Design a protein around this ligand. Structure first.
Ligand SMILES: C[C@@H](CON=C1c2ccccc2-c2ccccc21)C(=O)O
Ligand SMILES: C[C@@H](CON=C1c2ccccc2-c2ccccc21)C(=O)O
Lengths: 116, 112, 116, 112
């Protein structure tokens, strides 16, 4: 299985958010953010294949979603620079994580679905 | 003010102004009687709907006319309206807040 | 394809909302709500097979999600009686509709994803 | 009050009380300088963070300590915290509102 997936929806058009840039970081032993994985959502607004179970070890992760470039190419000037989701992962063994974000120019919501 | 309504616009980051709101009480025959109504003010709020005397235990529906709000802004919406249905009992002050987007809304109750 | 699907998530547990009752109605020519379809979300919190393209004609629909029974069997007394989503469908030809609801005891959110 | 914070609890339908909030300004070297902080009051609100003089154009991050809030209630949360990152420019009053659930939060900006 694929342990980390990202799903993005547009709440203005009622559609997947397509071609949204995503960057994932893991908190360093030295207290800082190391690049972990990056990608772009597809035509269904999903991003698969960021990591593997082997490489996705315990840690603190930050999933940064580049909402402002997205809204920009649609002629919108949004409030947020981006949407960042920060969470501890795999601290009681391996899990599968989907991080969904719902986007509006001045609002966004994010929910995590974690299965075992 | 036992019952207040607060509407926001997630496209523009602003109160949602002049939104028609209709409130209904469920009658014993299972249908909705009009109870209160109004339009949101400049701060997206609607106060003075009921009084403590009249706001007795029961099932109330609050209906927010979101489709007109979007239509007047030139934006095409998904929902006919947004409806919030709950039971008021005595075991407070109720704020019903709604956050609007054309294809998405949320609603939260703040009970204090 | 399957023209109307419902997806329900629990925002307290970060999981699909399983065994959630859903009732769909269509607005009558005589101004009232006729029963159109009903079902229960599965282990992924999805409900498929409510209708067919042939039977899913233009109209106004109401998708009622029985949030209070759900929260009740988990020992929670929620605010809402249910979550109802009301929308015009297929008014410019057939579409596919997913109605997602996100649920918390005093809050819920619903978004529609409409594709063609 | 150029910048205000409003936190709500979606599990209990109540303001989120005594939530630590830290605000940062981005420094020219690309790092976050502490700027303002406080705890939400009984009505889930935090006022008096800055003044108009000090709140100049720039990128600000607001960080809401949601994990402590849930931990103190005996409920296990998903996020380390909730962060809102935006640019303040002069082309207002900013309310940053956050609606919290253990595995889900939303944030909306009301700019008037
Ligand atoms: C996304 C959530 C958040 O609600 N946002 C609120 C909100 C946003 C800006 C200013 C005041 C409020 C407020 C007051 C009482 C209850 C909720 C709010 C929703 O409206 O469902
Ligand atoms: C906060 C928004 C977001 O919806 N979340 C979705 C969501 C979250 C996790 C996995 C799949 C989905 C999905 C698929 C189709 C449409 C919506 C979603 C809501 O559910 O109201």
């Amino acid at each position: 299985k694929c342990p980390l997936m990202v799903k993005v929806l547009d709440a203005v058009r009622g559609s997947p958010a397509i071609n949204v840039a995503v960057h994932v970081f893991r908190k360093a032993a030295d207290d800082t953010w190391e690049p972990f994985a990056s990608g772009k959502t597809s035509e269904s607004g999903e991003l698969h294949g960021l990591t593997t179970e082997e490489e996705f070890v315990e840690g603190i992760y930050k999933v940064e979603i580049d909402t402002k470039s997205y809204w920009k190419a649609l002629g919108i000037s949004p409030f947020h620079e981006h949407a960042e989701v920060v969470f501890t992962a795999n601290d009681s063994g391996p899990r599968r994580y989907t991080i969904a974000a719902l986007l509006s120019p001045y609002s966004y919501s994010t929910t995590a679905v974690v299965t075992n």
